[PDB]
């Protein structure tokens, strides 16, 4: 009589603000949320309130369940027949109800004996309230024969506590892009999901029908339900202010952004990365320690202060502490640096007819429950607006895109997202569906909406709350092949392999083959790949879910309906339904044995199966691959400046993230390489904008208006177990052009995956091609696949240095002599007795004339006039070559006997000897810049002398490094590029082919090694003796066999020179041959000629490479094997000769069979690189540095070759000292 019922929600139910019926029309949000749980503001201030559900909404759901219950039983219930009720109020007789029914009404052949009236009414007319004193206008509660009171939440209460504002979406099926959106409040069902209310029934004739309908009400307020009858943030902000102020005091403000990114990333590592001091400690000897974690904030290192902060802010937990501190550091950084929509925001909120639907008498209606798990085969992303925006009641971003989570931070698959993707695939399976019209007066009777109205899903939440990995994406500038300005954003993505509890309820008369097809389409089984594209970022392969462990059960609703109501349709107990066996099934629920198989489904085979065609292939990288993850490099104990990207993969079997992160090339990088590869060949990349554009690139890869027709997945490394050391440590350094030593700040290292030609990395990746791909576009993707296979587009960073060069692609089955002779120099040739002594290094004073080309060559296309191709070169070692492997400071395992003595092996990857392409590129860059009179790209401006001006002031202004493309780029900076312009030449790693493997020396403990003399940093004070002196030029080292002196005095070197003062290193023998690949794009006929000339200058001219250049080591001669160009033809020698001549002609223009020696700067440059002992020659010039004084070690008696005497201005005045240093091969013991 006075039923008190409790209504419980089993998924996040929608909430809306309460507005009176007349005041509701003014607000679109509340009119849309008329079937939601109403929120009213208690008190004032719009802060707290009380959540409730209108009894009219519970009544509408109940009388809807009475309709279905009576329709299922053909108008009867437990023997008492019921008429069709009434659902039409004439406007003339009385006013309309507050809510009009747009939906079809289930009706039946009425079998009640008499027409229902006030005296005698059927249980349906009792529950409707057709004949009782209660009417459209409420007067008193006693008038209601059946009364539904308001349902107050069982738990003032803040809106933000109970509900979270979320933006839902309407995605256009044809374009794949959101048509519009709308915001709701998804209230918390776990804490505020129980609503209690009183149903007062004053006619017991409908008691049995009413109580059954309460158990038949499946969903309410947007959520499945069962109806049963019964500041830390402010303190973190202040100390983040402290951090930013400290960084500003250290003039490292730009490091605050990277620190904020690293701190937010620290949530992944956990408490132990701070409380165990697991952060990288920096270099072993560096006074400054780590460049970021050891920045002293207030007299203490940043790691220690982070430990103190964690101790202070332990209450909020590690994840909240790192998210807030990372955000607070971001928030403050934005206000320290700085930081409206036209046409408004596309936030859209949406004659009555009675349509009686009469199911045929005797039809059998069933409810099919499909319970499985949605396994994320790819890193999923369910988009959500920023937490500042996603605040209910009130309507800077550290993370540009946030994934959707719970109050408990568990990853969430929304019912809306699962329904929208199911509707998308149902429309695909049917082949015909509607663009969902909102607020239409007539139910959409399309084949999709008909099934969607019978389909109910669940809000799936993973039992996994670890923080999301951040994917950074950039946009390449097509013209410069660098990052587009302002194009750097991060996305929170959930781990792949994460399982979500999938629930699908279909209540109907027959199970459609289209829903079976979609379920089969989403299923993963044996060879099939699950194809449940859920959520956003599908083009970057985010959210390819797979349905697994699918059990389809059947509710016989015509016979076993009392049991269905008793079990409440297994609502909220669906996870129990998945684990439970067929013997433990609830009464009336039976497994669906007639679930059509995958190949027996007509909609699946023509509509869903061919929709996305996978193209799986194995990228084979024969180079060290580095898809840099700088943020994760700061937080990992390696202390490497750049480390390879790795992803967190969730193992469903172990119910945890796999201990070893999966190394992969991100799908975004995988996608972007293709988009560039297709764009550059079709010229679409060069288009200024792509708004309302239907070009080849925009049709394939989508644009702001159309979704991509191709979805790219990550290139997972499937070779991790093969490599003994997967990640190679490669040190890099920028050598000053003026002084052959390292720059002040420019020294770094990378941690790429240790790929090599003999042991390449295999990156198995795949992309999905949409059905209906044009034949021309299918060729475009294949051509892009060929471009990457040919090695045009290296993967990851440092491509021009030789990183990530693709050796080949394996598609899965399921789919020349340069005969120039330089005359040399007179002094070394005349002195056949080698009496005179030469300075080891010499300076090339080309001059201040630098030709800066303001017309920068765009990377956005393969220009037909310009030359793009590849050079195959052989590098022969004329003298022993030293390329030390700095990954192991004790690579020779001899530091134990000599502590602190730095010993390295020859540079190698996976045990095969190498020359890094950076070494080749850098050594070729200095020669090219010297040849072309380019700027001093790497130069120590900040260094001083011992004075009035720094070296930058003494250097000519035109010789200064090119900054920005506005002023133009010098030929060296135009070829090899700058920070603003990616270089057009790529140098690969040089693989060792043949020759005497090592220079064996018996005295050395390792026979293949050699202990060098002390190599001290170049000091400009000698080259610039006085303030009136200028920069002498670019330092170059003469080719000589001075290594023999080092080789023959190995015992004396070790016994006298301090062990830590010098190094021991594995040195190659002369005649060793290395082969490296030089890939060039968009080269002039002269630029390729100059590059070809730079590689192989002449017969008796070589380069200086690697360690020990002043000691005669590293004289390497580069020989061109083959030059290949494409528009892939093999350019012959005659055409190569043509290219080189044009480079000579271009050098003539700048000056104002080519004999290079006529040009004064090249002649000076070429005698520097001329090899006196090359071919057949008896010249053995004595080239070494002067000793400090006569008493210094190594001084030879009978000679005045000392720095004390040469440094003295009386014997050697400053002008002739610089005159000597400028002139190559000038004798220095008998000083010229």
């Amino acid at each position: 009589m006075n039923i008190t019922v409790e209504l419980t929600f089993f998924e996040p139910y929608r909430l809306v603000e309460w507005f009176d019926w007349d005041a509701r029309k003014k607000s679109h949000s509340a009119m849309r949320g008329q079937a939601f749980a109403q929120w009213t503001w208690k008190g004032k201030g719009r802060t707290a309130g009380k959540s409730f559900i209108t009894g009219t909404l519970v009544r509408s759901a109940v009388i809807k369940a009475v309709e279905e219950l009576l329709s299922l039983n053909n108008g009867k219930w437990e023997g008492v027949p019921c008429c069709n009720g009434s659902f039409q109020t004439d406007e003339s007789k009385g006013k309309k109800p507050s809510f009009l029914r747009k939906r079809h009404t289930l009706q039946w052949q009425a079998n009640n004996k008499n027409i229902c009236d006030k005296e005698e009414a059927c249980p349906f007319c009792i529950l409707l309230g057709r004949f009782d004193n209660a009417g459209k206008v409420h007067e008193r509660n006693k008038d209601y024969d059946i009364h539904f009171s308001n349902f107050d939440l069982d738990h003032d209460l803040r809106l933000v506590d109970i509900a979270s504002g979320r933006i839902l979406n309407r995605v256009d099926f044809d374009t794949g892009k959101a048509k519009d959106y709308f915001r709701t409040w998804e209230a918390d069902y776990e804490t505020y999901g129980t609503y209690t209310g009183r149903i007062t029934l004053r006619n017991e004739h409908a008691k049995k029908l009413l109580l059954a309908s309460l158990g038949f009400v499946d969903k309410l307020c947007g959520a499945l339900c069962r109806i049963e009858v019964i500041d830390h943030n402010d303190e973190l902000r202040k100390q983040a202010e402290v951090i930013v102020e400290a960084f500003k005091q250290n003039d490292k403000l730009e490091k605050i952004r990277i620190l904020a990114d690293a701190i937010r990333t620290l949530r992944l590592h956990g408490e132990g990365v701070i409380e165990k001091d697991e952060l990288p400690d920096g270099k072993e000897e560096r006074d400054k320690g780590h460049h970021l974690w050891d920045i002293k904030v207030q007299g203490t290192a940043l790691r220690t202060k982070l430990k103190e902060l964690w101790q202070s802010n332990k209450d909020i937990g590690w994840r909240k502490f790192t998210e807030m501190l990372g955000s607070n550091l971001y928030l403050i950084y934005k206000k320290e640096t700085g930081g409206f929509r036209i046409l408004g925001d596309t936030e859209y909120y949406s004659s009555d007819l009675f349509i009686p639907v009469t199911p045929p008498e005797g039809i059998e209606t069933k409810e099919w429950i499909i319970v499985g798990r949605l396994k994320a085969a790819t890193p999923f992303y369910f988009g959500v607006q920023q937490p500042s925006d996603s605040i209910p009641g009130k309507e800077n971003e550290h993370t540009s895109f946030n994934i959707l989570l719970d109050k408990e931070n568990r990853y969430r698959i929304p019912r809306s997202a699962l329904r929208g993707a199911l509707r998308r695939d149902l429309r695909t399976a049917f082949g015909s569906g509607c663009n969902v019209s909102l607020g239409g007066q007539i139910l959409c009777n399309c084949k999709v909406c008909i099934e969607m109205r019978r389909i109910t899903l669940k809000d799936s939440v993973s039992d996994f709350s670890e923080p999301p990995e951040i994917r950074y994406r950039i946009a390449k500038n097509p013209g410069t092949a660098t990052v587009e300005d302002g194009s750097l954003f991060d996305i929170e993505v959930g781990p792949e392999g994460l399982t979500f509890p999938f629930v699908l309820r279909y209540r109907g008369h027959k199970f459609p083959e289209q829903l079976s097809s979609v379920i089969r389409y989403w299923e993963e089984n044996d060879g099939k790949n699950g194809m449940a594209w859920l959520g956003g970022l599908d083009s970057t392969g985010k959210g390819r879910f797979a349905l697994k462990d699918i059990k389809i059960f059947e509710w016989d609703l015509n016979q076993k309906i009392n049991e269905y109501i008793k079990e409440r349709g297994m609502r909220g107990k669906e996870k129990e339904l998945l684990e439970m066996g067929e013997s433990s099934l609830p009464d009336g629920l039976i497994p669906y044995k007639f679930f059509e198989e995958r190949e027996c489904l007509f909609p699946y085979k023509e509509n869903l199966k061919p929709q996305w065609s996978e193209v799986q292939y194995t990228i084979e990288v024969g180079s060290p691959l580095l898809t840099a993850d700088t943020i994760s490099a700061l937080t990992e104990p390696g202390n490497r400046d750049a480390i390879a990207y790795k992803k967190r993969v969730y193992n469903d079997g172990n119910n945890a993230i796999e201990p070893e992160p999966r190394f992969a090339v991100k799908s975004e990088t995988h996608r972007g390489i293709f988009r560039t590869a297709v764009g550059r060949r079709t010229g679409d990349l060069g288009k200024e904008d792509h708004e309302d554009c239907t070009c080849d690139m925009c049709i394939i890869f989508g644009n702001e208006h159309e979704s991509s027709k191709i979805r790219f997945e990550d290139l997972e490394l499937i070779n991790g177990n093969e490599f003994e050391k997967l990640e190679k440590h490669i040190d890099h350094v920028a050598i000053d052009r003026f002084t052959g030593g390292a720059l002040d700040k420019a020294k770094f290292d990378t941690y790429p995956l240790a790929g090599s030609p003999k042991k390449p990395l295999k990156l198995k990746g795949r992309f999905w091609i949409k059905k209906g791909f044009s034949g021309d576009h299918k060729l475009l993707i294949t051509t892009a696949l060929s471009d990457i296979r040919d090695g045009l587009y290296p993967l990851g960073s440092k491509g021009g240095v030789g990183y990530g060069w693709v050796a080949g692609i394996s598609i899965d089955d399921n789919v020349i002599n340069n005969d120039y002779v330089h005359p040399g120099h007179q002094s070394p040739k005349q002195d056949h007795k080698n009496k005179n002594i030469y300075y080891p290094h010499y300076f090339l004073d080309s001059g201040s004339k630098v030709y800066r080309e303001k017309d920068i060559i765009t990377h956005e296309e393969f220009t037909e006039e310009l030359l793009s191709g590849k050079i195959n070169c052989k590098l022969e070692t004329l003298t022993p070559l030293i390329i030390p492997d700095t990954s192991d400071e004790n690579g020779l395992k001899l530091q134990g006997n000599k502590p602190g003595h730095k010993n390295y092996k020859f540079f190698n990857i996976n045990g095969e000897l190498m020359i890094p392409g950076s070494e080749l590129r850098g050594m070729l860059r200095t020669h090219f810049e010297a040849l072309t009179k380019s700027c001093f790209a790497i130069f120590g401006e900040d260094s001083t002398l011992s004075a009035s001006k720094t070296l930058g002031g003494k250097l000519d202004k035109a010789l200064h490094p090119c900054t920005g493309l506005s002023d133009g780029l010098c030929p060296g900076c135009h070829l090899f590029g700058t920070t603003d312009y990616k270089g057009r030449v790529k140098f690969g790693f040089a693989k060792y082919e043949n020759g005497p493997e090592w220079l064996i020396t018996r005295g050395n403990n390792p026979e293949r090694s050699l202990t060098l003399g002390v190599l001290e940093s170049p000091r400009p004070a000698f080259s610039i003796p006085d303030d009136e002196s200028e920069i002498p030029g670019r330092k170059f080292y003469l080719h000589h066999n001075g290594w023999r002196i080092i080789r023959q005095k190995q015992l004396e070197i070790r016994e006298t020179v301090q062990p830590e003062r010098n190094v021991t290193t594995e040195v190659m023998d002369k005649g060793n041959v290395f082969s490296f690949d030089v890939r060039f794009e968009n080269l002039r006929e002269w630029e390729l000629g100059l590059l070809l000339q730079s590689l192989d200058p002449g017969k008796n001219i070589a380069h200086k490479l690697g360690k020990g250049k002043p000691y005669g080591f590293g004289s390497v001669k580069i020989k061109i094997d083959s030059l290949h160009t494409f528009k892939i033809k093999r350019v012959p020698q005659s055409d190569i000769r043509e290219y080189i001549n044009k480079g000579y002609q271009k050098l003539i223009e700048w000056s104002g069979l080519p004999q290079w020696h006529v040009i004064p700067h090249i002649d000076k440059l070429y005698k520097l690189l001329w090899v006196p002992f090359l071919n057949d020659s008896k010249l053995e010039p004595d080239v070494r540095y002067p000793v400090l004084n006569e008493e210094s070690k190594g001084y030879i008696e009978g000679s005045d070759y000392t720095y004390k005497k040469l440094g003295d201005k009386d014997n050697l005045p400053y002008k002739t000292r610089v005159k000597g240093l400028t002139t190559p091969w000038s004798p220095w013991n008998p000083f010229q």
């Binding site: 079809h104 408004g344 349509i355 045929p360 509607c434 007539i442």
Partner: protein
């Protein structure tokens, strides 16, 4: 200053977009770029922006909405926001003199269009007061500013006197005929002089495509005249409808505008009110108005944005239509064989009264009767909702629909309106296309079907009426094997007919004008674009657009389809229904007669239809419906459901 250069960049981009020579593709980009330059500095400066720069914000906002064409039936929310966004900044110029003169000039026109596209936010009284102050502010420079004439003329629509201002604008050079005709009607109550000027407007309307603003304005003017009891809309609605016919004749698709249906409803109503031979000449003119409305179907802009001789010809129509939308702001009806009667149906949205125009060739008499389609449509929706759920089990809902067809349309059984033995050709309108008019029960005890007395043929429109091999019977088939076996391998079928799995190109292959063509496949309906509706044949299927161009052989062929029309056309969510099925696509490419089922029936019923057509093609379909199974509708209603499902589309 910085603001001076800002406008110098933004005030010349707008005029570059404001000129008519700029293409709409470029114009939208130009306005957005200028607005980005303009609004971008508004974000930086907020109220620091001067009134002159605040003036030009609304100019971009007014112009940006011009490029926001309606992508569907309703006016866009984005276009409404731009007008709302524009009316904000220009209002900011009023509270913050050549500045005020031009401020009220653009504040008012933005509200004029705001009141036009959305009258609820910008009320008529609110709009009246706004432009009334323009008289107070003296926005009466009608010689130089086009917008200025719009102001004094939108005002007299509201009811403002403006007797003094008449002397200026009618002699103003830049006042168009429609505006001049308006200013001649309600500024001074001289209905006579509005006839000549509006005639020039309607005469000039024969060349401006239907997307032009003048088309919507001229119908709105007659919308004002109609209901004013001015006795002048009757002549005017007919006159402009004539201009629509000339303009529309230049794929059988037309530009969609909301006033187009009102134009034809008002022209139809004008003739109906004006309704011996002259008296019957109007009644015939009702059919020509009705036929012209169904001669082509309106395509929503979003549908034509996404669709090659047909392709090349269509893009010209799409380009020409979009340019004109932005330009303004910146067979015989009696040629029927003897013994046939033709019933042209027209549904009036103006008044909830549909009416059927009938032409008895033997009597050479034109007459019409009106019927209430409001209640019949609800009964149709009840059948449509029940059929889509239960198919043949909704037969009981078809009978009450067919009885409702007889009940609300009793003239179909009246001998004077339709003779007892005369063949009836149906030309339905809107939801009557889905109605089984042939099988309708007369509203009387044991009422016989309409189909029993007359053989009924259907035509999407009278414009589809058209005027060789007598032993070649081709059969296409992509249906499942188990449904058609004994019919599949009959001896009559020709060699050029793939009888197990048919392809889209093989349909294009049939030549020599066969007597019978059978296509048995699963049709699929594009719910928005009729051109994209396909007959699923092998891989991909062949669409309405593809059938129009690719298929050429079946000229005069009697076509039989195996795909239900409910799968060929989308379900009806409204009274209007212009989504033409694949059957009429065949009708355009000759194919005299296209017999197909109106809804899903068991494959045996289609089998018997084909086999009975195989024996003698000259047999009337009506006889098969009554002599085999159907015409019962009382005992075993699904049998009546299965038979009546077959209609004959297309009459030669």
């Amino acid at each position: 200053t910085r603001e001076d250069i800002d406008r110098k960049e933004a005030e010349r981009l707008l005029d570059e977009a404001f000129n008519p020579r700029t293409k709409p593709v470029d114009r939208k980009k130009i306005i957005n770029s200028a607005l980005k330059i303009l609004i971008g500095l508004y974000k930086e400066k907020k109220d620091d922006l001067t009134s002159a720069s605040f003036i030009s914000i609304a100019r971009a906002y007014y112009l940006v909405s011009i490029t926001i064409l309606p992508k569907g039936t309703t006016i866009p929310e984005k276009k409404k926001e731009a007008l709302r966004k524009g009316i904000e900044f220009i209002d900011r110029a009023i509270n913050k003199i050549l500045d005020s003169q031009r401020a009220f000039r653009i504040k008012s026109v933005l509200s004029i269009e705001f009141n036009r596209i959305d009258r609820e936010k910008c009320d008529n009284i609110k709009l009246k007061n706004l432009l009334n102050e323009a008289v107070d502010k003296g926005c009466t420079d009608f010689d130089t500013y086009e917008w200025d004439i719009q102001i004094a003329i939108r005002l007299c629509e509201l009811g403002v006197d403006m007797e003094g201002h008449f002397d200026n604008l009618i002699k103003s050079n830049k006042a168009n005929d429609l505006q001049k005709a308006k200013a001649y009607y309600f500024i001074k109550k001289d209905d006579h002089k509005a006839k000549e000027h509006m005639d020039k407007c309607t005469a000039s309307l024969k060349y401006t495509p239907c997307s032009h603003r003048l088309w919507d304005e001229t119908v709105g003017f007659i919308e004002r005249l109609k209901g004013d009891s001015s006795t002048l809309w009757r002549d005017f609605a007919i006159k402009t409808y004539r201009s629509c016919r000339v303009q529309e004749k230049e794929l059988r698709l037309r530009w969609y505008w909301s006033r187009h249906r009102v134009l034809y409803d008002m022209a139809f109503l004008a003739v109906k009110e004006q309704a011996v031979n002259v008296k019957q000449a109007k009644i015939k003119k009702l059919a020509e108005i009705s036929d012209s409305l169904k001669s082509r179907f309106s395509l929503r802009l979003s549908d034509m944005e996404k669709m090659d001789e047909s392709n090349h010809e269509f893009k010209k129509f799409l380009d020409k239509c979009v340019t004109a939308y932005q330009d303004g702001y910146v067979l015989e009806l009696t040629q029927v064989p003897e013994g046939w009667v033709v019933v042209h149906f027209y549904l009036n949205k103006l008044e909830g009264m549909g009416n059927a125009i009938v032409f008895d060739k033997c009597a050479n008499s034109w007459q019409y009767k009106e019927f209430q389609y409001k209640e019949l449509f609800e009964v149709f929706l009840t059948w449509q909702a029940n059929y889509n759920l239960y198919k043949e089990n909704a037969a009981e809902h078809l009978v009450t629909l067919c009885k409702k067809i007889g009940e609300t349309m009793p003239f179909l059984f009246c001998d004077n309106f339709i003779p007892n033995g005369k063949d009836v050709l149906f030309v339905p309108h809107d939801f009557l296309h889905r109605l089984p008019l042939h099988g309708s029960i007369e509203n009387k005890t044991n009422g016989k079907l309409f189909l029993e007395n007359h053989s009924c043929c259907y035509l999407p429109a009278w414009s589809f009426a058209s005027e060789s091999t007598s032993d070649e019977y081709v059969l296409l088939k992509n249906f499942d094997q188990g449904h058609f076996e004994t019919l599949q391998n009959n001896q009559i079928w020709g060699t050029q007919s793939v009888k197990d799995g048919a392809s889209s190109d093989d349909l294009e292959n049939i030549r020599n004008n066969p007597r019978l063509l059978t296509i048995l496949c699963h049709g699929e309906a594009n719910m928005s674009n009729p051109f994209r509706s396909m007959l699923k044949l092998a891989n991909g299927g062949i669409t309405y657009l593809e059938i129009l161009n690719s298929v050429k052989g079946l000229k005069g062929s009697q076509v039989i389809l195996g795909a239900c029309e409910t799968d060929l056309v989308p379900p009806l969510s409204d009274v209007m229904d212009e989504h033409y099925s694949v059957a009429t696509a065949l009708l355009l490419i000759g194919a005299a007669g296209v017999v197909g089922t109106m809804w899903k029936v068991r494959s045996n019923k289609t089998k018997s239809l084909i086999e009975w057509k195989l024996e003698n093609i000259e047999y009337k379909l009506n006889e098969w419906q009554k002599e085999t199974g159907g015409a019962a509708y009382k005992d075993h209603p699904p049998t009546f459901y299965r038979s009546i499902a077959f209609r004959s589309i297309g009459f030669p």
